[PDB]
Structure 1
Amino acid sequence: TPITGKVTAVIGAIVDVHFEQSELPAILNALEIKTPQGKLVLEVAQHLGENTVRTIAMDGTEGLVRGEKVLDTGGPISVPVGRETLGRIINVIGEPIDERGPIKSKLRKPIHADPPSFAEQSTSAEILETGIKVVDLLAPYARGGKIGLFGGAGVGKTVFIQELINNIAKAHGGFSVFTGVGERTREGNDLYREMKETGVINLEGESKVALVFGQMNEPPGARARVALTGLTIAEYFRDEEGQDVLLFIDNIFRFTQAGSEVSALLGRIPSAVGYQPTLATDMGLLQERITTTKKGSVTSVQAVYVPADDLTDPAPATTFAHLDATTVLSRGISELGIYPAVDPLDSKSRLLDAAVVGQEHYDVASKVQETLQTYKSLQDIIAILGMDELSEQDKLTVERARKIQRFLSQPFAVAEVFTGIPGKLVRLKDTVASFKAVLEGKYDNIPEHAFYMVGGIEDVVAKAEKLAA
């Protein structure tokens, strides 16, 4: 609504406006300050009374002159949704930053949208196999699920997601949303190029993927509502189109982090580690706007930049709570050179059950877990005294486990450049078989190096021959 105001304060990117008329926009309304930098979009976040709101600014605030005229756009920012989104990279505002000009708008929807109700929930049970051995063996995914990754971001974390895109999303087909909060601009450009190359984006034709990209150069405040914008695009697919989607979020640490930055400026008493007090609510709301309703099933992949790789940090901790499966990837396992670097004793899925994937799968997994846990248990003893000073029975276990550890590496085709090894995807049925044999020590008689950086059991057998020469 045309409500003039003046800019009382510009304390960071948290401008405060003072409306001069007694008509006052409500909280989560949006305002445009028009400048020679065009509109700057701000969003009301507090009412501080005396006709003075305090607004988060979703665009950079450098150059603002106090008292500058504001005009209130009214209500939450309305992005444009449709299938016309597919084949666009859109800014937080909704601007087509892939410069395919104005997006043909159908319905433009408010960024803030209440999460669907308890009644609307529909529980999954699907098996989604990625053909990644470690994923398949340890913690199978499911369609509609919330998948989770933890560790250093784009230190292999980004690559993991890229492998997932490469596998899952061609098979899945249909709508898919990639939303990248605070990602490295060059990496995003690579993704854009790659997507166009793999035709998922075909700009000449139609694209069955849409993209939202928020660069890490984008101001902290902008980054906060990149996520909400992406979720709206997803909701249009989930609800209105009613076709199964995909969603990628990288990193949802950036969502939390962005909030913590603005929180201080906003005027909140800092909570532990310095995180915003509204950390629990904001994360909660976000993670319940990503869900599988009876209307539609949205498989989501969420990437958590764990700061200093401390899981005990409250922001990663509260993330762990809202995920349906996680596959924490550890720097230590990275040092061991195992790519994928998923920690095998720190993965879980509610889909790993002896009903869900059957007793035989579960039994296979049980033995892997036990073997590896023993190996972890004897790590102290191994270091202090030689392995020869361990019990003979234990030495068999240790040798088996060393083999299992090496076996778990699966070359990835997206990482084909980096590894220099052509990637291989191994069937879920094949994976269970391969591990079963190894657990029975069938192929335990050939070097650890044979198991190192190679795919399935058959490949190992062949690789023994290669080494033997």
Structure 2
Amino acid sequence: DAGYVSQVIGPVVDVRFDGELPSILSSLEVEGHSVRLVLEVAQHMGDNTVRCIAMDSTDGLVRGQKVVDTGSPIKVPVGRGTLGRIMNVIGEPVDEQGPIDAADIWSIHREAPEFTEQSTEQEILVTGIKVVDLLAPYQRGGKIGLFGGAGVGKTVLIMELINNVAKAHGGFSVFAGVGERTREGNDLYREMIESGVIKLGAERGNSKCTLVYGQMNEPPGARARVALTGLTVAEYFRDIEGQDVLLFVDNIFRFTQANSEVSALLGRIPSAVGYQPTLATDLGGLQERITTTTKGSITSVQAVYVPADDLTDPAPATTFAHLDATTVLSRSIAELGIYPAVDPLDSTSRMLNPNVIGAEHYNVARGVQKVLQDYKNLQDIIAILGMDELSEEDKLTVARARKIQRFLSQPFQVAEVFTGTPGKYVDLADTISGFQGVLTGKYDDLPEMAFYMVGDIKEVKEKADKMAKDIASRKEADNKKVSEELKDIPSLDKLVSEIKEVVIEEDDGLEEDFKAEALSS
């Protein structure tokens, strides 16, 4: 009736079943474990043995431990009762707010929709980020990828896309935290209590977001299936309630890394640079479910970590064919201080056709990319020689591109604690109007750093007029202010005497604490 553990090697458990093996992808429960240990059948090994991956740690598993087949795959709660909650990979609440109310429980494994129920509709998703909505504009209903190595700004950009797109739109949101830091998953949770996206207590039904978290400490079996769990919550909102969903996945790279960590223990000889042989089809089975169908619409935004800033690597390179907008973030843009560090040339969207976004958005975007590409072909000769042989046609396209480079920078409303600047939402029309000014020489007289970290072209003129006030405001405070004051710069021990001297205890006293922890519990 039930099976027993026959082999435990790392996160991969073999379970021997006397009679009627469970199906592949089905969920098994190990009873007698300290925590709830869910296994998922990866393959039939062939001697009435299945090979499984564990959704938790296998420390404490014993050969011979009873394993109960559940008869179905991993089933998670879906519905409005998950809005405002944090789920596990297996659907357990990890926010300590009680059990999750469930309209239905759904298998996290399903097939891709079909070819017949695909949606061929392109409408722009305006994000407020002017480098995005100019050069690589996002599609309302399409898959969006945020590429970039470690520390270029994938999580700040995906945080700014949350409060610029999900903070006011019609449907619901799902954040799938797949194998990233627990600290920033708590930062995202507490930011959405304060923003009112997640409401706690009796106002929980007015939430607009569900978190599904599978962060870095979880075993590779867990992180390989969180993206399927968060997608299942998004697939209920699309298939059953028929409405538009936003699905944010932080590092879809970690889904491919997690399958790669168990892959050799599942008996697979490795593929190229170290990934599993099923790398493209494991990834393709996931991304083909995140689609706009004829029932509703899932606007996916996936961060993709590129390892060692390498877009050639097979896990980022496979993701590129799955997306409708690939915002590529670069370290060289980040090292100059342009934030968001979007590579303006490498970012590609499918909404950048003239018959989709119009001609006055397409030609500005193709004009901005031409001036930035020409500058990179001159920067080979500027960094050697130094722009005194550059024709004053080439000198103007260096000054125009350097204004274009800073004008793609924008202060983010969520990066207000990194950059000391309140964030700017730029509308789509003000982005088109601004870059058409910088391209056609309408703003050639303004300084270069007047474009840096501003909203639109009206705030370049409110910053160039500000800096030309405040550089000639230097010499008021030179000849004075050293002495002769109203004595609110007072004497020495005047400022030392309001120092409330805190009592130092001059010994740690932990052995009195350690005995006190023995008497408690």
Superposition TM-score, scaled by structure 1 size? 0.97
The alignment partner of 2:4 has SS state of strand
The equivalent of 1:460 in structure 2 is 460
CA distance in 2, matches of 1:257, 1:38: 25
The equivalent of 1:232 in structure 2 is 232
> 2:78·2:102 contact (CA, 8 Å) conserved in 1?
yes
Instruction: Note if 1:59 corresponds to 2:56.
Output: yes
Aligned residues: 466
Give, as a single letter, the amino acid of the residue that structure 2 aligns with 1:451: F
Give, as a single letter, the amino acid of the residue that structure 1 aligns with 2:81: E
Q: Deviations over 1:7-26 (max 9, x none)?
A: 2110111000111x222112
The equivalent of 1:182 in structure 2 is 179
The equivalent of 1:49 in structure 2 is 46
Shift in Å, 1:260? 0.7
Shift in Å, 1:389? 2.4
2:94 to 94, 97, 100: 97
The equivalent of 1:362 in structure 2 is 362
CA distance in 2, matches of 1:379, 1:264: 46
CA distance in 1, matches of 2:12, 2:36: 16
Structure 2: gaps (5+ residues): 470-521
The equivalent of 2:14 in structure 1 is 16
> 2:5·2:16 contact (CA, 8 Å) conserved in 1?
yes
> 1:124·1:142 contact (CA, 8 Å) conserved in 2?
no
- Counterparts in 2 of 1:375-414, with a 5 A limit? 375-414=375-414
Q: Which moved more, 1:319-328 or 1:384-393?
A: 384-393
Give, as a single letter, the amino acid of the residue that structure 1 aligns with 2:48: N
Instruction: Note if 1:258 corresponds to 2:264.
Output: no
Instruction: Note if 1:151 corresponds to 2:181.
Output: no
The alignment partner of 2:284 has SS state of helix
The equivalent of 1:435 in structure 2 is 435
Q: Which moved more, 1:49-58 or 1:293-302?
A: 49-58
- Counterparts in 2 of 1:301-312, with a 5 A limit? 301-312=301-312
> 1:173·1:208 contact (CA, 8 Å) conserved in 2?
no
CA distance in 1, matches of 2:36, 2:422: 49
Shift in Å, 1:156? 1.8
CA distance in 2, matches of 1:106, 1:396: 62
Shift in Å, 1:154? 5.6
> 1:411·1:422 contact (CA, 8 Å) conserved in 2?
yes
Shift in Å, 1:155? 4.5
Structure 1 residues 95, 226: CA separation in 2 closer, same or farther (over 3 Å shift)? same
Runs of 4+ more than 3 Å apart: none
The alignment partner of 1:449 has SS state of coil
CA RMSD, 1 decimal: 1.2
Shift in Å, 1:394? 0.7
Instruction: Note if 1:29 corresponds to 2:26.
Output: yes
Identity of aligned residues (%): 76
Shift in Å, 1:437? 0.9
Structure 1: gaps (5+ residues): none
Instruction: Note if 1:136 corresponds to 2:143.
Output: no
Give, as a single letter, the amino acid of the residue that structure 1 aligns with 2:464: A
CA distance in 2, matches of 1:38, 1:293: 39
> 2:28·2:69 contact (CA, 8 Å) conserved in 1?
yes
> 1:124·1:145 contact (CA, 8 Å) conserved in 2?
no
The alignment partner of 1:210 has SS state of strand
> 1:325·1:350 contact (CA, 8 Å) conserved in 2?
yes
The alignment partner of 2:66 has SS state of coil
Instruction: Note if 1:73 corresponds to 2:70.
Output: yes
Instruction: Note if 1:373 corresponds to 2:373.
Output: yes
The alignment partner of 1:430 has SS state of helix
Which of the pair has more CA radius of gyration? 2
Give, as a single letter, the amino acid of the residue that structure 1 aligns with 2:194: E
> 1:8·1:18 contact (CA, 8 Å) conserved in 2?
yes
The alignment partner of 1:426 has SS state of coil
CA distance in 2, matches of 1:39, 1:335: 45
The equivalent of 1:5 in structure 2 is 3
Shift in Å, 1:139? 1.5
> 2:141·2:291 contact (CA, 8 Å) conserved in 1?
yes
Give, as a single letter, the amino acid of the residue that structure 2 aligns with 1:86: L
CA distance in 2, matches of 1:354, 1:70: 59
The equivalent of 1:338 in structure 2 is 338
> 1:333·1:343 contact (CA, 8 Å) conserved in 2?
yes
Q: Which moved more, 1:93-102 or 1:324-333?
A: 93-102
Shift in Å, 1:153? 4.6
CA distance in 2, matches of 1:5, 1:462: 72
Superposition TM-score, scaled by structure 2 size? 0.88
